[PDB]
RNA sequence: UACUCUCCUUUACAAAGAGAACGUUUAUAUGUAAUUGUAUGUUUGAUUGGGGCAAUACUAUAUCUAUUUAUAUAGAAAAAG
């Protein structure tokens, strides 16, 4: 028995239905919402409590696009009710074999760590370091030494906010991989590829000129 | 709580007939919609003089 | 009339690609399995790279021994 | 599918509506194992074009308790060795253990 | 599925292109009101169940009854027309064929009038050559609605064929 | 689209078409499609405005909507009346057109030898046409579906003495002495 | 390419139902 | 007189040796003995039996048959699939189509 | 799912789905109730730039709305009465990229 | 042996005497040049006969037309366009794409010029732009297509632009490719172009290698 | 291999210079001598640009700060116009093209 | 129901991938643990072919011969081979 059946989930707007479950967060396998509160009142009385430049910014149409799940299609204009399942696909698909490669992450070093085995350093303060998928999660990050280099890590921290697309795409192969090093050896660690850097070879004289 | 009350094999009649489209559906609430009565059906389409 | 003068047939030195003793010969139509499509070079050789297939259809060119075929 | 060594790319088609059988059904949207159907049915190029998948959970959405992200458990149909035998099987996904540590409780 | 849904009401009259296989060779006199009734009924039993849709789900999607959106409103209380072509509404038909049939009852009493203009310009106060019957025996019923038209008896046949007189 | 003399634009060519003025038709076959075509847009629009008039009361509580909802009756004026104007007027310009080269053909031919024989020149007056129009011209075939009456072959059907017989009832009776048929073998 | 036989008489025909006139 | 002509028995197996003027009767269009004329198109007759004035089904589809079914009262709001669309070259679409 | 809003038939028959010698705006406005839609394109606006959406996006214009110029369907037939009323369409038009 | 796939240009036969005898009966205006609607709409040919290519003039037992024909048909036969051209008549053929195919059949549901789509290639090698039917095309397809832009040299004769500011190769890997095909074939005047060593064998790719000029 | 077209409106993260970048037809691998690799993960490797580049890092040049990263938000073209309408009209010239 | 020879759904063995925290996915394998189907036909236990001699009969009758040829479909040869 449902004493109080609960109002729709997103009624919040005067003369038009509340978009539907699922977008708001809900149920999905519905298109269209309706909330029994809109259809009841009267024409007139959905015209009374509104102006005309007000159901313009209500009729607004964000055609393929959701108002609400920003960046995924409406889902009341795709096949069927359900998320797409297209970009929320799982990573592995239904046949390839799991030669995820090793994967390493980018983690903002909080204090200068200084490993005592290489005798160098883990990281400095307040550098991002690539390091281990599985020597950050279990022993950077519990120990306070490491944090995600996400964007808002940055945020928080007082860093200009950088981009290193965290785990932006997962490569599934190692040669899918070590091109994915290819594209990210050239965003974050660009010196690597300056006309100064490629010619440390020569600022000076041919090396058949100099002294002895 | 917003679902129906009712194991849905008893209120089957609502989700294969042409009631899929008379009716709420979001998350199992098969609850009529609104629905016009045959006073007013008129009462709307013959002050337009349709 | 106009005088324009052109020849009575037209000569190409390009060979016939359907031979009658060849088996797969022929011009197929623009939908048509190319010649040795999914193939690869090995007889009825679409049937063992099934298996490599990474998923197939729910009715996808089974067992089928020619009886009454 | 072009045969030419060097296919740089371009707008369109450059030699027409792409030939080839494997062509016709990515041309339709559909992927490229629809070749291997030996019946399309009007259902058949719906089940295969992934309108909805045809795969689901393992428990409940209310007693789910190990965390899939966003998964099924698809059934990849396989076809078998030397005698082609089409057969079915339900894939799960990898679930580890997830040993984390979530420093908001200081601890893993 | 498909049944030709755009000739429900796209017939000459009401009993067209509505199947029905329930017929019968001689329906009665009730089964006849049943009959004439009944084709009407599913054709406004049909409208008014796919008006109450319409209007319905229109009124659930927020807007106007008949689809009008907020647009359609706003340009109606500025005078613009909104609609392209306005087809011809109810107070149209029903007088668009009000005066065609004021014009036919004017004409008959104008008509009505003129005949008598030649019925009286008929002075045969007997019957004319067709009242021969060496060909075949006239028709003493139709003589008896002739009648009228004459001044001598008419349907006065003798036993003998006609001879003219 | 062709659909009339102008040329498709399929004419992307610039192909001519030279020699013309140069046939008088009477648009015959075209002016019968057209009596065809104008009856069906009339035909629609009878339907487009159809109104309820419920000559029964257990119905009549629609007798003012029309009998078709408004986005179908909508539709119906857009889909197959303005349809339909369309291929009226299509016809009524293949013979507006046709009509404008007789017009012009009527008077440069009129003049020549004969406005006599003019209407003869341009004349269809094949020499049965009386079978069709006028058939109690025609004789020089018998063409009547019910043969045994035509003039020419009237003395077929016997003239029997009939009578009437008022002891009977005013009802018509032959007098023809019944012949006694075949009996055995 | 434009057209030139009968490059009028798309807007000399069927006079549209003829008024009382005809 | 419909002759269903076949090409000859023997015109890709085992050539080396074969009759010099015999591995060429494999190569005309010979009739198939009647025998097997009336087998085959006997599951064409099928179409409506009884009804001795229909014609058999043809083995390949004639250019008028296909257009009879699109040519019925029922199909003629089909603007697709009408006129042939199957048969017609590959529909062209929006270069921005995109499934 | 105990409950499917559309019946594989209708998962599967895209004619009812895609823009496909269908129209896909039932309304047809007159030369005023035009030149009044036009009135809120905004400036800056080119037709160059809202794209088609792909097929799995149902085909449905839901009429002269706020931001309507947006819905690519909307647009393309409002573009198309703009002709048959003979109202200029400023903006421009598809440009098809090579 | 006669399969028909997506695309083949099988034409329905509509015999010169058909065409020839209802000029006359006055089903056609002679005057009119006669597209395939005046033939559909005057019940010369039915919606059963007219299929996508649309249609074939034979010239069937016909040894003389009379009077000056004009007509706008699909690959008309060559002695059939020869009895027209001598009487003083035209015959272009039109050789539409099923998008055409409607519109010319059905105008009064098109009533803007909705725009028509140029056939498929392999129609435009065979009709649309052989002059040897008239096709429509053989005007344009001599005066604006057959001249390559004007900055492509020898090997980009075919692309819509030059895609180098140079005919010859561009990288290593288009040169290599060429300067090992330029000597795989044996050394052929134009056979630098890399061509693909495979036929598909298809019939879109297939024109006419022997026959009539 | 896309066998359609899409241009997507990519959103650099240096300058946000919103320049659009095209994906044009690049033909399916040989289905004559099958490759099953290569054309099951050609083929659902095409879904993930067809829906916005979902699990892919993009890799084209700028055009405002001429240079090749990997730092590029692709904008849906509703999200675009959410944009692009709410720009003063000269940083349309900065940030648009 | 059964096993060296046929074949899947198969849960075991091995490889790989995850700083390998254990569950999965593959590849290669195919087990009577595997429940599929075959295991003949004709004369009685051998024979299966195309000829010929035996009244231009031939049950297999009786004898023998021998490039007397193995049709199609996928592969193999791309001109006529
Ligand atoms: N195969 C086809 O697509 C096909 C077949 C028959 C007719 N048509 C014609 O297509 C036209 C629409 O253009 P499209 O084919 O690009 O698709 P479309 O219908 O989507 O065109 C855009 C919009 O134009 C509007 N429109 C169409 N005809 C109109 C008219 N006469 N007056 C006012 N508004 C009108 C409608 O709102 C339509 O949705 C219609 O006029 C129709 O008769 C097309
Ligand atoms: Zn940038």
């Known amino acids: 028995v449902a004493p109080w059946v609960p109002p729709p989930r997103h009624d919040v707007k005067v003369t038009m239905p509340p978009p539907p479950g699922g977008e708001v967060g809900g149920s999905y396998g519905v298109s269209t919402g309706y909330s029994d509160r809109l259809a009841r009142t009267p024409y007139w009385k959905r015209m009374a409590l509104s102006t005309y430049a007000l159901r313009m910014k209500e009729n607004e149409t964000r055609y393929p696009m959701s108002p609400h799940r920003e960046g995924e299609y409406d889902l009341r204009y795709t096949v069927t009710a359900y998320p797409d ?78 981009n290193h697309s965290i785990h932006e795409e997962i490569p599934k192969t190692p040669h ?12 974050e660690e660009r010196w690597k590829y300056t006309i100064e850097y490629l010619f440390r070879k020569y600022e000076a004289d041919p090396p058949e000129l100099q002294d002895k | 709580a917003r679902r129906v009350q009712c194991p849905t094999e008893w209120v089957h009649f609502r989700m294969h007939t042409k009631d899929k489209l008379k009716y709420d559906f979001q998350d199992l609430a098969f609850r009529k919609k609104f629905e016009y009565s045959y006073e007013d059906v008129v009462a709307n389409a013959k002050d337009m003089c349709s | 009339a106009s005088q324009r003068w052109l020849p009575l047939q037209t000569l190409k030195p390009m060979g016939h690609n359907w031979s009658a003793a060849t088996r797969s010969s022929g011009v197929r139509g623009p939908h048509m399995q ?20 990474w998923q197939q259809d729910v009715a996808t060119a089974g067992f089928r021994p020619h009886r009454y075929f | 599918f072009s045969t030419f060594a060097l296919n740089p790319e371009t707008s369109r088609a450059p030699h027409g509506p792409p030939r080839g059988l494997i062509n016709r059904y990515i041309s339709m949207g559909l992927p490229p194992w629809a070749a291997w159907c030996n019946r399309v049915n009007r259902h058949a ?33 396989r076809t078998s060795r030397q005698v082609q035998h089409v057969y079915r099987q339900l894939k799960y996904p990898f679930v580890k253990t997830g040993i984390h540590y979530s420093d908001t409780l200081d601890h893993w | 599925g498909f049944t030709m849904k755009y000739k429900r009401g796209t017939g000459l009259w009401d009993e067209d292109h509505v199947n029905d296989f329930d017929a019968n060779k001689y329906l009665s006199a009730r089964s006849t009101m049943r009959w004439y009734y009944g084709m009407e009924r599913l054709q406004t039993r049909n409208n008014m169940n796919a008006r109450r849709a319409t209007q319905s789900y229109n009124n659930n999607m927020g807007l106007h009854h008949s689809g009008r959106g907020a647009f359609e409103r706003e340009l109606e209380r500025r005078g613009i027309q909104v609609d392209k072509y306005p087809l011809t509404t109810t107070t149209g038909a029903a007088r668009v064929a009000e005066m065609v049939l004021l014009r036919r009852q004017e004409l008959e009493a104008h008509a009505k009038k003129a005949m008598e203009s030649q019925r009286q310009a008929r002075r045969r106060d007997a019957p004319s050559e067709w009242y021969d019957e060496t060909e075949g025996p006239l028709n003493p019923r139709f003589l008896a609605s002739m009648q009228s038209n004459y001044t001598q008896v008419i349907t006065e046949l003798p036993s003998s064929p006609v001879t003219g007189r | 689209s062709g659909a009339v003399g102008r040329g498709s634009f399929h004419s992307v060519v610039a192909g001519a078409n030279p020699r013309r003025i140069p046939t008088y038709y009477n648009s015959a076959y075209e002016l019968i499609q057209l009596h065809r075509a104008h009856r069906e847009v009339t035909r629609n629009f009878l339907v487009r405005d159809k109104v309820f008039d419920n000559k029964f009361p257990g119905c009549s509580l629609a007798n003012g909507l029309f009998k078709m909802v408004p986005n179908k009756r909508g539709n119906f004026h857009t889909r197959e009346l303005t349809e339909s104007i369309r291929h009226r007027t299509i016809w009524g310009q293949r013979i507006q057109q046709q009509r404008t080269i007789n017009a012009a053909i009527l008077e440069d031919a009129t003049k020549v030898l004969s406005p006599a024989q003019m209407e003869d020149r341009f004349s269809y007056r094949t020499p049965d046409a009386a079978a069709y129009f006028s058939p109690q011209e025609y004789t020089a075939a018998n063409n009547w579906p019910n043969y045994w009456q035509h003039p020419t072959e009237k003395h077929v059907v016997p003239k029997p003495r009939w009578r009437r017989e008022p002891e009977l009832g005013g009802i018509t009776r032959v007098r023809d002495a019944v012949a006694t048929p075949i009996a055995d073998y | 390419r434009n057209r030139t036989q009968h490059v009028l008489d798309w807007m000399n025909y069927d006079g549209n139902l003829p008024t009382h006139n005809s | 007189s419909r002759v269903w002509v076949a090409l000859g028995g023997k015109m890709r197996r085992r050539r080396i040796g074969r009759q010099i003027d015999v591995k060429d009767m494999r190569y005309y269009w010979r009739p198939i003995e009647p025998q097997y004329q009336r087998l085959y198109m006997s599951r064409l007759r099928i179409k409506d039996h009884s009804n001795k004035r229909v014609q058999p089904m043809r083995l390949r589809a004639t250019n008028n048959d296909i257009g009879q079914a699109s040519s019925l009262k029922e199909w003629e709001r089909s603007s697709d699939r009408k006129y042939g669309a199957a048969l017609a070259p590959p529909k062209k679409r929006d270069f921005e189509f995109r499934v | 799912s105990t409950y499917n809003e559309k019946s594989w038939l209708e998962k599967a028959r895209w004619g009812a789905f895609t823009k496909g010698s269908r129209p896909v705006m039932r309304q047809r406005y007159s030369a005023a109730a035009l030149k009044e839609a036009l009135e809120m394109v905004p400036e800056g606006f080119e037709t160059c730039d809202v794209p088609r959406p792909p097929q799995r996006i149902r085909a449905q214009s839901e009429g002269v709305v706020g931001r309507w110029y947006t819905n690519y369907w909307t647009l393309h037939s409002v573009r198309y009465q703009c002709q048959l009323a003979g109202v200029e369409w400023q903006f421009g038009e598809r440009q098809r990229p090579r | 042996p006669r399969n028909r796939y997506e695309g083949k240009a099988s034409f329905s036969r509509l015999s010169l005497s058909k065409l020839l005898w209802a000029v006359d009966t006055g089903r056609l205006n002679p005057n009119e040049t006669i597209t395939l609607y005046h033939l559909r709409n005057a019940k010369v040919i039915a919606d059963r006969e007219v299929v996508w290519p649309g249609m074939v003039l034979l010239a069937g037992n016909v040894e003389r037309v009379p009077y000056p024909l004009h007509i706008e048909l699909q690959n008309a036969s060559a002695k059939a366009i020869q009895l027209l051209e001598e009487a003083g008549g035209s015959f272009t053929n039109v050789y539409m794409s099923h998008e055409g195919l409607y519109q010319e059949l059905h105008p009064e549901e098109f009533p803007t010029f909705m725009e028509q789509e140029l056939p498929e290639r392999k129609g435009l090698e065979n009709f649309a732009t052989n002059s040897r039917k008239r096709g429509w095309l053989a005007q344009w397809y001599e005066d604006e297509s057959r001249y390559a832009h004007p900055g492509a040299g020898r090997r980009t004769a075919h692309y819509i632009r030059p895609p180098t500011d140079r005919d010859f190769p561009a990288t290593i890997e288009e040169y290599e490719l060429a300067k090992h095909h330029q000597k795989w074939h044996l050394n052929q005047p134009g056979s630098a172009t890399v061509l693909p060593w495979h036929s598909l064998n298809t019939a879109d790719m297939a024109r006419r290698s022997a026959g009539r000029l | 291999s896309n066998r359609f077209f899409q241009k997507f409106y990519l959103r ?32 659902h490797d095409e879904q993930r640009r067809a829906a916005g580049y979902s699990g892919m890092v993009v890799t084209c040049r700028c055009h405002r700060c001429e240079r090749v990263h990997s730092n590029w938000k692709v904008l849906d073209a509703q999200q675009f116009l959410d944009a692009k309408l709410r720009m003063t009209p000269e940083e349309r010239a900065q940030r648009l093209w």
């Open chain 3, 34 to 53: 190319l010649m040795q499509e999914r193939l690869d070079q090995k007889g009825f050789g679409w049937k063992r790279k099934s298996r490599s297939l």
């Open chain 4, 45 to 77: 190029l719906y089940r295969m074009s992934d309108v909805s998948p045809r795969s689901f959970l393992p428990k409940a959405p209310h007693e789910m308790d190990v965390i899939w992200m966003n998964e099924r458990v698809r059934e990849r149909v």
């Open chain 1, 176 to 187: 899918a991989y070590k091109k994915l090093l290819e594209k990210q050896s050239y965003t």
């Open chain 11, 12 to 43: 650099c993260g240096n300058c946000s210079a919103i320049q659009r970048s095209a994906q044009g037809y690049q033909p399916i691998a040989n289905p004559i001598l099958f490759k099953s690799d290569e054309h099951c993960r050609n083929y």
């Open chain 1, 85 to 162: 399942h297209i970009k929320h696909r799982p990573l592995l698909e239904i046949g390839e074999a799991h030669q995820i490669p090793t994967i390493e992450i980018p983690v903002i070093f909080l204090v200068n760590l200084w490993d005592e085995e290489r005798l160098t350093w883990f990281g400095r303060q307040y550098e991002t370091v690539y390091v281990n998928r599985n020597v950050a999660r279990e022993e950077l990050l519990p120990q306070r030494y490491a944090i995600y280099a996400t964007e808002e890590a940055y945020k928080l921290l007082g860093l200009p906010v950088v």
